[PDB]
């Protein structure tokens, strides 16, 4: 009634990257207790985008993380009111992305609202040149702090060339009402682009995420 074993979501993003404004609207579905989800996203303003899709793809759903039975699933516990998160990503060539997100449960669906700001990407780097090829699998190190949940990630983007482009990521997740925090644990994440049209104005994504104890 709050969270079924199968749940749909709607997402809206408004963003800019190096000053290029855009909007994206999407719909997805997944199995929140199995840690799996898919979404289809559409660029509704600002398309086609002059930058790599991959810097957007991790901003489109942490209600869909499989947790062990003995770890409180802080973000699921926050619903129906939900939670907010704030993220900063520092890319190795100076690019910066800051993201703020609102998550709620309305009429049996999750509703995601995202605001994104990317700045200082080199005009000759892989993001503005669209030279990226998807994210390697990640491990998000989770820990409680200041009454919030924090996650840190060393994220690695593959390049069409071969080789690497790294980002350091830190996210704060906060429930809209007090919720019991877990201890430290890790979330293993894999995000795939499963389909896209030639210019990435329509993209389909798949993500699997699983929480694991990092001690014991």
């Amino acid at each position, epitope marked *: *009634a*709050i*969270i*079924k*074993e199968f749940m749909r979501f709607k997402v809206h993003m408004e963003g800019s990257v190096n000053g290029h404004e855009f909007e994206i609207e999407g719909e997805g579905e997944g199995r929140p*207790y199995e840690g799996t989800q898919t979404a289809k996203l559409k660029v509704t303003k600002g398309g086609p985008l002059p930058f790599a899709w991959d810097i957007l793809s991790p901003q489109f759903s942490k209600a869909y993380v499989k*947790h062990p*039975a*003995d*770890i*409180p*699933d802080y973000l*699921k*516990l926050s*619903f*129906p009111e939900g939670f907010k998160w704030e993220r900063v990503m520092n890319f190795e060539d100076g690019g910066v992305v800051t993201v703020t997100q609102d998550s709620s449960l309305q009429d049996g669906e999750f509703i995601y609202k995202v605001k994104l700001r990317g700045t200082n990407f080199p005009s000759d780097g892989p993001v503005m040149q669209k030279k990226t090829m998807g994210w390697e699998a990640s491990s998000e190190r989770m820990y409680p702090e200041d009454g919030a949940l924090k996650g840190e990630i060393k994220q690695r983007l593959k390049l069409k060339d071969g080789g690497h482009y790294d980002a350091e990521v830190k996210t704060t997740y906060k429930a809209k009402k007090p*919720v*019991q925090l877990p201890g430290a644990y890790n979330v293993n994440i894999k995000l795939d682009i499963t389909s896209h049209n030639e210019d990435y104005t329509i993209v389909e994504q798949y993500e699997r995420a699983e929480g694991r104890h990092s001690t014991g």
Partner: nanobody
Amino acid sequence: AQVQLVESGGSLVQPGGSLRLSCAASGRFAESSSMGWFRQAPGKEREFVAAISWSGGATNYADSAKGRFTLSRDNTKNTVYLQMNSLKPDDTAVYYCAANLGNYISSNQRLYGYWGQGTQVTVS
């Protein structure tokens, strides 16, 4: 044992009578425990009755329980109360409470990681 569950209230009652079961959750995560009631009659499958979220704010009832059972939560004591009205003989069973830390309140038994020992309801 981060959640311990203790059911009580099992008793003999006459057809058409009513009983109030309770389940007290204790342990570090008792305050985040969503609790579900399941019943198992002798030589039969466990079946969902009703569940209520950790906040006491969302409730979900099997069709058999709608209109006649009421599930509520006292958040002071992390205790849930199942008021069962209009009981029939086929309601005879062991009633178990189960909990989870993921805000799940539906019928899939595998999503409940913590189980009580059960309490016997007999209607006759």
